[PDB]
Amino acid sequence: FELRPVIGLTRGLSSADIETLTANAIRLHRQLLEKADQLFQVLPDDIKIGTAAGGEQHLEYIEAMIEMHAQMSAVNTLVGLLGFIPKVS
Amino acid sequence: FELRPVIGLTRGLSSADIETLTANAIRLHRQLLEKADQLFQVLPDDIKIGTAAGGEQHLEYIEAMIEMHAQMSAVNTLVGLLGFIPKVS
DSSP states (O other): OOOTHHHHHTTTOOHHHHHHHHHHHHHHHHHHHHHHHHHHHTSOHHHHHTSOOOSHHHHHHHHHHHHHHHHHHHHHHHHHHHSSOOOOO | OOSTHHHHHHTTOOHHHHHHHHHHHHHHHHHHHHHHHHHHHTSOHHHHHTSOOOSHHHHHHHHHHHHHHHHHHHHHHHHHHHTSOOOOO
16 A cells, blocks of 8 residues: 555565564554654744744654654555554553 | 655745755665665575565564655655755765
C-alpha cells in the first residue's frame, strides 16, 4: 500500500516476525507523536496562532512531524500485511 | 506529493526554509542508505541469498530499509515543494 518495498522486504517471513515488526512500528509511532507534541508545547505564540512561520525552532518541530507522518506509512503498510492490529500496551 | 501532510506543514514558509528542510532530508537519506548498507554486509549468506529469512539481525536490517524507504517519501515531497534538487555534500 503506502510503502510497496515493505512487501518485498518481508517476503519469506512468518506472520510472527511480521507481527513483531508491526508492534515495533506502532510503539515507535506513539513515541514520535509524543515527541512532536512536546516540541509543539514550547513553540512561540506567533507560531501557535499561525501569524508567523519559519525559524529554527519551528523547523525542528516540522521535521518532527514529517518524521512522524513518514513513519505512519510504515505502520499502515505493516498492519495491512499482518491482517490485524496487535496490542502493544 | 507522496507525504501529503507535508504540504500543509510547510505553508507560509519561505523558499529558504523549505530548501533547508530539503537539504537536511537529503543528508538524512544518505545516512540511512549507508546505515542499511553496513547492516547488510554483516548478514549471513543464508539470508543474503534467500535460503533463510528471519532472526533479530535480519529484522533489524529490514527495519533500517523500511525507515530508508519511508524517509524517501519525505525527500521527494520536499523536493517537489522546493522546485528543484538542492546541492548538499
